[PDB]
From Swiss-Prot, chains A, B:
Key words of the record: Cytoplasm, Electron transport, Flavoprotein, FMN, Transport
Keyword field contains Aminoacyl-tRNA synthetase: no
Subunit organization: Monomer and homodimer.
Top-level taxonomy: Bacteria, Pseudomonadati, Thermodesulfobacteriota, Desulfovibrionia, Desulfovibrionales
One Pfam family in the UniProt entry: PNPOx_N
Protein's UniProt name: FMN-binding protein
Cofactor: FMN
Organism (species): Nitratidesulfovibrio vulgaris (strain DSM 19637 / Miyazaki F)
C-alpha cells in the first residue's frame, strides 16, 4: 500500500498532519516525519503524547487522513513531493504495536493507522 | 495576531496542511512553507492550482484548519515547533489578494485564510 517514494520521504525531516472528524468540524494535529514507524500489513504507528481531542474523534469515526512530504524527494514534475494517506485509526496502550513506539517515554499510547490508500499528490 | 515564531517557521522548508469539512468527513491538502504570503489584517494567502475539492468544501463551510512547522525553529521544550491555525477561507481570482500570488504562473486562484487564532502546539 505504501510506495518506496513514501519511505524516501520518511528519511527526511518534516511535519506530518493527521486530520480527524470532530463534532463541529475537522481537527488536525501533527507528528514529525522521523517518528513514524511502519509495520508489516500497511500499518503506520505514531507515538501519542497528547492527541486527546484526536482520540475522542477517532472513537466516534475511525477514518483519518494523513499528509506528509519533503522538498528533498523528487516528485513527478520537479523536486519535492508528498502524500495523502487514508486509513482507519486505533489507539493502543499495550501490545506489539504500542511497543513499536514505546522507546518514546513520553508516549501514553500508540496511534495505529491501517492504510487503505496512499496517493502521491505532487 | 500571528507571532514572530510563526514567521521564523516560514523561513524554513516544510509541508503546510490545510483541512476542510467535506460531505463525508474531513479533507486535507498541502502547500509548501515558502509559498505562504502573509498580509496585514491577519491574512495568509496561498497559490491555488488544484484544490477543487477543497474549494467546494470551503463554499459549504468557510472554516479551515492549518498546520505547519519546522525542526529548525525552537519550541517551548526543545528544537522544533509548529502551529495550529484556525481561520475562514475565501478563493480570489482577481484583485490585490490574487495579485499577491502572481509569481506562481500555474495558479488559478488565491486561497485567502483570515486567521482567527494561532496556537504554537510544541
Ligand atoms: C511539529 C510537531 C510535532 C508534533 N509531534 C507530536 C507527537 O509525536 N505526538 C503527540 O502526541 N503530539 C505531537 N504534537 C502535538 C499535536 O499536534 C497536538 O497539538 C497534541 O497532541 C494535542 O492533540 P489534540 O488537539 O488532539 O488533543 C506535535 C506538534 C507539532 C507542531
Ligand atoms: C508538498 C506539497 C505541496 C503542494 N502545494 C500545492 C500548492 O501550492 N497548490 C495547490 O493547488 N496544490 C498543492 N499541492 C497539491 C494539493 O495538496 C492537492 O493534492 C491538490 O491541490 C488537489 O486538491 P483537492 O484534493 O482539494 O482537489 C501540494 C501537494 C504537496 C504534497
Amino acid at each position: 500500500m505504501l510506495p518506496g517514494t513514501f519511505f524516501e520521504v520518511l528519511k527526511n525531516e518534516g511535519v506530518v498532519a493527521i486530520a480527524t472528524q470532530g463534532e463541529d468540524g475537522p481537527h488536525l494535529v501533527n507528528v514529525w516525519n522521523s517518528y513514524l514507524k511502519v509495520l508489516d500489513g500497511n500499518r503506520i504507528v505514531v507515538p501519542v503524547g497528547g492527541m486527546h481531542k484526536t482520540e475522542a474523534n477517532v472513537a466516534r469515526d475511525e477514518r483519518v487522513l494523513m499528509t506528509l512530504g519533503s522538498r528533498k524527494v523528487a516528485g513527478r514534475n520537479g523536486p519535492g513531493t508528498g502524500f495523502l494517506i487514508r486509513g482507519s485509526a486505533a489507539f493502543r496502550t499495550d501490545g506489539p504495536e504500542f511497543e513499536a513506539i514505546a522507546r518514546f517515554k513520553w508516549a501514553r499510547a500508540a496511534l495505529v493507522i491501517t492504510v487503505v490508500s496512499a496517493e502521491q499528490t505532487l
